[PDB]
Paper text:
An R12E vFLIP mutant was generated to maximally disrupt the vFLIP–IKKγ interactions and a D102R E104R vFLIP double mutant to disrupt vFLIP–vFLIP contacts. All were observed to have a similar elution profile during SEC MALS to that of WT vFLIP with the exception of R12E. Rather than eluting predominantly as a monomer (preceded by a small dimer peak), the R12E mutant had an enhanced dimeric component comparable to that of the monomer in terms of UV absorbance (left). The tendency of this mutant to dimerize was confirmed by native mass spectrometry and shown to be reducing agent dependent since treatment with 10 mM TCEP resulted in a shift to a predominant monomer when re-investigated using SEC (right). These observations could be explained by the crystal structure of the R12E mutant that was refined to 4.2 Å. In this structure, six R12E monomers form the asymmetric unit, two of which appear to be appropriately positioned for formation of a disulfide bridge mediated by C106, in an extended but weakly stabilized interface that also incorporates E12 and K13. Furthermore, ITC experiments confirmed that the R12E mutant had a similar Kd to that of WT vFLIP consistent with previous reports and the high levels of similarity between the R12E vFLIP and WT vFLIP co-ordinates in the vFLIP–IKKγ(150–272) complex when superposed. Whilst all mutants appeared unimpaired in their capacity to associate with IKKγ following immunoprecipitation consistent with our biochemical and biophysical assays and were expressed at similar levels, R12E displayed significant reductions in its capacity to phosphorylate GST-IκBα(1–54) and NF-κB activation. Although the D102R E104R mutant was the least disrupted and had a near WT elution profile, the R12E mutant lacked a defined hetero-octamer peak that was instead replaced by a broad range of interchanging higher molecular species extending from the hetero-octamer region almost to the void of the column. The fact that the R12E mutant appears capable of forming higher order species based on our SEC data, the lack of a clearly defined hetero-octamer coupled with the defective oligomerization observed in blue native gels suggests that the vFLIP–IKKγ assemblies capable of activating the IKK kinase are structurally specific.
Pivotal to the survival of both tumors is the canonical NF-κB pathway that becomes constitutively activated by the virally encoded protein vFLIP. In contrast to the ubiquitin-dependent mechanisms, persistent IKK kinase activation by vFLIP proceeds via a direct association between vFLIP and IKKγ. Taken together, our results are the first to reveal that vFLIP-induced NF-κB activation pivots on the formation of structurally specific vFLIP–IKKγ multimers which have an important role in rendering the kinase subunits active through a process of autophosphorylation. Key to the formation of oligomeric vFLIP–IKKγ assemblies are interactions contributed by amino acids R12 and E104 in vFLIP.
Author numbering: 0 to 117, 124 to 170
The structure:
């Protein structure tokens, strides 16, 4: 299965300011605070270098939290895809899935404190994680740079799920 170029444009229009950052992270190619041109520009490069398969995008929208779109553009049943991607193995790494979950369990007070504690990561948790990818501090092998930043913030309860995944 493969992601159609025409469908890819319809997904980029219906993606909000905050959703953009999440999708790009799950697809590996990430650009912080992206415009419509920047979002389609990365998507076109994945569907041109064969990487953008149909179930990679179907799962990408199911994991991002946009279950409305599966039945809108992809014409899939999100209830069947939910029951399907449970027994089926996930396209994404448990490191990509952990970062996305840690993102959701963060508060506005913590996200501002994140910046003042640590280019200089403009108002994004995924933007800070992207810095560590280039600065060799966060990776699927090493997540202790995040564990220290979690303990030294307030969310000490998130270190248990992180230590697992």
């Amino acid at each position: 299965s493969m992601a159609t170029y025409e469908v890819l444009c319809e997904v980029a229009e219906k993606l909000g300011t905050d959703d953009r950052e999440v999708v790009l992270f799950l697809l590996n190619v990430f650009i912080p605070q992206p415009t419509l041109a920047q979002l389609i520009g990365a998507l076109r490069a994945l569907k041109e270098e064969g990487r953008l398969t149909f179930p990679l995008l179907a799962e990408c929208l199911f994991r991002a939290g946009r279950r409305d779109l599966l039945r809108d553009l992809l014409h899939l049943d999100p209830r069947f895809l939910e029951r399907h991607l449970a027994g089926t193995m996930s396209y994404f790494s448990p490191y990509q899935l952990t970062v996305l979950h840690v993102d959701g369990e963060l508060c506005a007070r913590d996200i501002r404190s994140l910046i003042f504690l640590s280019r200089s990561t403009p108002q994004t948790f995924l933007h800070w994680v992207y810095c560590m990818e280039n600065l060799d501090l966060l990776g699927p092998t090493d997540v202790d740079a995040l564990m220290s930043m979690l303990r030294s913030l307030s969310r000490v309860d998130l270190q248990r799920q992180v230590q697992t995944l």
